[PDB]
Design a protein around this nucleic acid. Structure first.
Ligand SMILES: [Mg+2]
Ligand SMILES: [Mg+2]
Ligand SMILES: [Mg+2]
Ligand SMILES: [Mg+2]
Ligand SMILES: [Mg+2]
Ligand SMILES: [Mg+2]
Ligand SMILES: [Mg+2]
Ligand SMILES: [Mg+2]
Ligand SMILES: [Mg+2]
Ligand SMILES: [Mg+2]
Ligand SMILES: [Mg+2]
Ligand SMILES: [Mg+2]
Ligand SMILES: [Mg+2]
Ligand SMILES: [Mg+2]
Ligand SMILES: [Mg+2]
Ligand SMILES: [Mg+2]
Ligand SMILES: [Mg+2]
Ligand SMILES: [Mg+2]
Ligand SMILES: [Mg+2]
Ligand SMILES: [Mg+2]
Ligand SMILES: [Mg+2]
Ligand SMILES: [Mg+2]
Ligand SMILES: [Mg+2]
Ligand SMILES: [Mg+2]
Ligand SMILES: [Mg+2]
Lengths: 49, 104, 159, 176, 187
RNA sequence: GUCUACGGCCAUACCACCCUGAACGCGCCCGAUCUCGUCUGAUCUCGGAAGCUAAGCAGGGUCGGGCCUGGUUAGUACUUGGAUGGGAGACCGCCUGGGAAUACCGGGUGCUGUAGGCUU
RNA sequence: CUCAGGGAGGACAGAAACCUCCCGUGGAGCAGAAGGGCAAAAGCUCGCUUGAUCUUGAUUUUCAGUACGAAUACAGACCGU
RNA sequence: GACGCUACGCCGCGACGAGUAGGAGGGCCGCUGCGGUGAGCCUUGAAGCCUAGGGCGCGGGCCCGGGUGGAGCCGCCGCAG
RNA sequence: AAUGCGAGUGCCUAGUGGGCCACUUUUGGUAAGCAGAACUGGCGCUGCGGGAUGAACCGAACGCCGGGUUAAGGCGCCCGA
RNA sequence: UUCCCUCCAAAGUUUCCCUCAGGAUAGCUGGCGCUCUCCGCAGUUUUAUCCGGUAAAGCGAAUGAUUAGAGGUC
RNA sequence: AAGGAGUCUAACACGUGCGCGAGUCGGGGGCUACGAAAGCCGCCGUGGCGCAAUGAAGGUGAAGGCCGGCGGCGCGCCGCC
């Protein structure tokens, strides 16, 4: 019941990232922010949560 | 005084405001456009479906009576499993009664 | 502006394939189409009677009427704000059985067989089509040799 | 790739999907220089898609580790083989640096290419890094430090911290 | 900001009757109390139909009432009408009927009471069956009005039997060019 | 093993040349009174059974041509989406996904449905 | 029945008249502009003919999904071959 | 044994808030006249006008204080322009 | 199959029917802040932070406020850093 | 082209017109609701199944254009 | 500073409120200060609109089924009570 458990949760209203974004317009492997940051989404989670 | 000739620039955005909806799918679509000979014969079949009505009930009631002789011929842990059973408002009623009678 | 001709821009669309000209084969004649069959439309330029219009080439619909040499097909058409259900009379050489519903019917009979099965055995067998999951954790054997070291090659001006 | 900070030096092993044709593909090891492992895997797939016919969806990353410097307390000569793009043409190079770590030498190489030839990190393509003996070096900027009795002074010590005594009375001294 | 669309945020539906008549507005208070204090959906439908306009509660004929209460199973039940029960004079026999309606016409009332049935109002229905049990909700033909013959696909279009707007009907009133195969075309 | 009548997919079946075909068949073949048609019984139609596998036909062969199917070409050319990337431009590089086609080099050279034969 | 074209031959006859053999996937032709299509044919030559006739509806094309024009499947008749 | 409930009233949870052309709703916003109604106001001072005065309402606007003035004026429920 | 969302339906209906700009594709032209198309997003209708200035560029769209943090940009002085 | 606030919110596109500074028509908008709920639908993907003749490529493959030698018999 | 521009009548459509309801409507006429108002008429409902359509028109004008008996056709059909 992951579909029901996830749809029960409202989408998370998170703040702006403390410290700052690297580059919003480019991908993460280009030294930016967009796309898949595999293990490094937690580093954004602590500064944004 | 030359003016713009033709464009479709905003049209795809105008179409999706009220949506691009498929036609209304209904069961029993109309027989209008079906060929006249087969359509004429289907009307003759519908006209005389009532003719063999008394023979039709003699088979369907036979099948319903044979239904009687057909159907009467055949006729994650133990700790969390116990605690979720006690926590049940109805199934764990006597188990909760036992716990309430455990401290006297 | 363009012309409003019926066969404008159909030069490669209604042309025969390479070395596939000549006499039309007879299996497209001696196959059976009934009402409710799902049929895709592909115009063939060898026969000229009963040709579908160019906006129905590559489309798929459902047969509602069957005649001596032709079938009538209900095809969805995108017109300028909306989709209409068109009823077109196409002669039988432009007509092919679609295989999209065939996999669904073979899955329906498989699901019904697999539901009749495992009802007396009491187990529960998966009937939904799950999407491609992440692959399970596995061991890769580098038995013997070490992995080969790859390096970028230097440039060669071969122009 | 953006050469962010200092680079870390990764050993990346990958392979193809096991198929009924190829039931076990050969494993391919590469020596990637990247700020992190997420960039390292992407650069691995870039290089191996350039060399072999294997893509990210048609293959997998079997291993991705940071392999360290075996001796970061001795100074070493590093020879680096380059392949870069200019504004008109692409060229190979061999450059020499003096550093304690291989990844530090390659990090210095990226700043050197950006400084001297305005070569951005996406055009720079490192192809071989090797520890070089001091008798095998070629560049005189590196061979001048191969001296047992090396000696130089610090001749013109420019005064930093110009704003903590910001309004001062004595004029600064540069001789030390 | 969010990329939502505020086009359909306000639903149009009626919250209250637009009429200011105080006898209807007391029945609205009664069934508004009943709809929120009972779990019966009958009171909700009756309360929503009390809000509606005159065209949305068309009158029932007595003959349509006889046929919709003659059906099997629904004997000894109360026919509940939100509109008006009008007399239908092309019927000869009237059985006894227990009637709840907002209005009953004077000649239909005589026929029902001579047949021997009862005619209730909605406060009487609320006293008798508060949850509306043993009742048959009925409503008039909503497409019975003449306005609906002019609606749909336009006239002068293939396969459209829509009544046009004419000042009068006759031989020379819109019967020539879009109607004849002789003069022009026929759709 | 294989043939005949009628076919299905229409070259893995076509084209060139060579070799071999037991039995049944298919043919070539012998004739023009009748049926039929021509300038001409060559074709078509008809009546046959002396001779022959010569040819058609079947099987096989050719570092065969073609065709079919793979590899290479090549993750190349091209391309979805992205950047306050580069360049004076022309254009190019990178990120994210998809991914061709020649030349060149291998393999193959009809499968099969119904009915009826021969190999008793 | 097979075309365009080509090769080898045959009195006058030659670049080019007619006859014959062979190769010929269309390199011809199908009224016209172009495109598509077509080989025991949709081309050429014959034989017989008038379905280029009467009559409802439906459909497609342009399209507003209106007409006109053109077109496609039928159905009811009388016919041609 | 507090308050409540002008039910066209009161109360509680969430989410949301750009706007030309344009459309709709609410105005205890404003002007003039009429039917009702305030045992309404007024020579112990109406309308109007002025005001470095006190305020209310998001706003349209409104209520008080001072002065000027000398004879009529306003609130609420509906109606009309 | 996954993900997400309450949908369906009927009347009456204003304004508009001069557009323009940008990535990519693209026609004519030597070219044009030129003329003409496709797709999507904008400006028109729209303020705000940045590009000194500024219809369209980058970021981000707006009820009245307090605290905190950011985007695109920046951090000698003007001018916050 | 004369007061306030609140809510929703465009188009310079199709077809026809002695139509090109304008109308009608469709589209975009608003208002009024109603029928249900308390299966259906989607400017999206996955899995099957069809369609194409652009980018590219080819001219030792047809058509058209086109450069050079080489080997040949009559 | 004052005046100053979507009004009035008729017709139609749609929505909404009221009354009566297969009916409804006295608008014209008549009877009996405000009041030129209000009330009343029903053998004053004439007449309008609705309750019936369709055809150019002559005209026509809005479910049937079963059973028994009889007649005809060769067990079914037609006609007839
Ligand atoms: Mg901070
Ligand atoms: Mg951008
Ligand atoms: Mg224009
Ligand atoms: Mg907001
Ligand atoms: Mg809005
Ligand atoms: Mg709205
Ligand atoms: Mg002979
Ligand atoms: Mg032979
Ligand atoms: Mg032989
Ligand atoms: Mg070969
Ligand atoms: Mg066989
Ligand atoms: Mg023939
Ligand atoms: Mg707003
Ligand atoms: Mg003043
Ligand atoms: Mg322009
Ligand atoms: Mg807008
Ligand atoms: Mg903006
Ligand atoms: Mg500037
Ligand atoms: Mg703030
Ligand atoms: Mg600045
Ligand atoms: Mg003007
Ligand atoms: Mg094309
Ligand atoms: Mg090209
Ligand atoms: Mg004024
Ligand atoms: Mg009305």
């Amino acid at each position: 019941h992951f579909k029901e458990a996830n749809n029960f949760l409202w989408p998370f209203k998170l703040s702006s990232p403390r410290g700052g974004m690297k580059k919003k317009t480019t991908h993460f492997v280009e030294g930016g922010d967009a796309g898949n940051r595999e293990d490094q989404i937690n580093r954004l989670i602590r500064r944004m949560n | 005084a030359k003016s713009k000739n033709h464009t479709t620039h905003n049209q795809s955005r105008k179409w999706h405001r009220n949506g691009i909806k498929k036609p209304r799918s209904q069961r029993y679509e109309s027989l209008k456009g079906v060929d006249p000979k087969f359509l004429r014969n289907m009307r003759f079949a519908k006209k005389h479906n009532k003719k063999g009505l008394k023979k039709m009930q003699a088979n369907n009631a036979k099948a319903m009576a044979a239904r009687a002789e057909a159907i009467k011929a055949l006729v994650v842990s133990r700790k969390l499993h116990r605690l979720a059973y006690i926590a049940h408002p109805k199934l764990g009623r006597r188990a909760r009664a036992r716990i309430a009678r455990g401290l006297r | 502006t363009n012309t409003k001709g019926k066969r404008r821009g159909t030069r490669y669309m209604f042309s025969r394939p390479f070395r596939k000209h000549g006499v039309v084969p007879l299996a497209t004649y001696m196959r059976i189409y009934k009402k409710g069959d799902i049929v895709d439309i592909k115009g063939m330029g060898t026969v000229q009677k009963g040709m579908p219009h160019k906006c129905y080439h590559g489309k798929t619909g459902r047969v509602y009427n069957v005649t001596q040499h032709a079938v009538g097909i209900v095809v969805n058409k995108q017109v300028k704000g909306k989709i209409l259900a068109k009823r077109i009379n196409v002669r039988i050489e432009h007509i092919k059985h679609s295989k999209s519903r065939d996999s669904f019917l073979k899955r329906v009979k498989e699901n019904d067989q697999k539901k009749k099965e495992a009802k007396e055995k009491g187990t529960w067998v998966q009937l939904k089509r799950q999407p491609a999951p992440p692959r399970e954790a596995h061991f890769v054997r580098t038995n013997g040799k070490e992995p080969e070291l790859l390096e970028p090659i230097p440039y060669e001006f071969m122009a | 790739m953006k050469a962010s900070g200092t680079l870390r030096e990764y050993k990346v092993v990958g392979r193809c999907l096991p198929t009924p044709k190829c039931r076990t593909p050969p494993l391919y090891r590469m020596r990637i220089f990247a700020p992190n492992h997420v960039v390292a895997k992407s650069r691995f797939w870039y290089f191996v898609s350039q060399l072999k016919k294997m893509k990210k969806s048609s293959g997998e990353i079997v291993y991705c580790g940071q392999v360290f410097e075996k001796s970061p307390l001795r100074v070493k000569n590093f020879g680096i083989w380059l392949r870069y793009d200019s504004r008109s043409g692409t060229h190979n190079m061999y450059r020499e640096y003096r550093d304690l770590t291989t990844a530090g030498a390659v990090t210095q190489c990226y700043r050197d290419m950006g400084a001297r030839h305005r070569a951005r990190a996406h055009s720079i393509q490192i192809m071989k890094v090797e520890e070089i003996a001091a008798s095998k070096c070629r560049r005189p900027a590196v061979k001048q430090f191969h001296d047992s009795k090396i000696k130089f002074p610090l001749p013109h010590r420019v005064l930093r911290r110009q704003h903590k005594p910001r309004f001062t009375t004595k004029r600064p001294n540069t001789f030390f | 900001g969010v990329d939502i669309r505020h086009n359909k945020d306000r639903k149009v539906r009626r919250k209250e009757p637009k009429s200011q008549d105080i006898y209807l507005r007391l029945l609205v208070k009664l069934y508004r109390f009943l709809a929120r204090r009972t779990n019966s959906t009958f009171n909700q439908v009756v309360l929503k139909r009390l809000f509606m306009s005159r065209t949305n509660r068309p009158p029932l004929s007595l003959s349509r009432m006889i046929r919709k209460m003659k059906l099997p199973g629904r004997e000894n039940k109360t026919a509940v009408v939100v509109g008006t029960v009008t007399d239908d004079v092309r019927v000869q026999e009237v059985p006894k009927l227990k009637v709840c309606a907002l209005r009953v016409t004077s000649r239909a009332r005589s026929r029902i009471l001579k047949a021997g049935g009862k005619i209730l109002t909605f406060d009487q229905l609320a006293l008798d069956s508060p949850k509306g049990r043993g009742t048959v909700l009925l409503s008039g033909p909503r497409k019975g009005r003449e306005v609906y013959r002019h609606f749909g696909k336009a006239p002068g279009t293939p396969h459209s039997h829509t009544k046009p707007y004419v000042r009068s009907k006759g031989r020379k009133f819109e019967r020539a060019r879009g109607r004849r195969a002789s003069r022009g075309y026929k759709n």
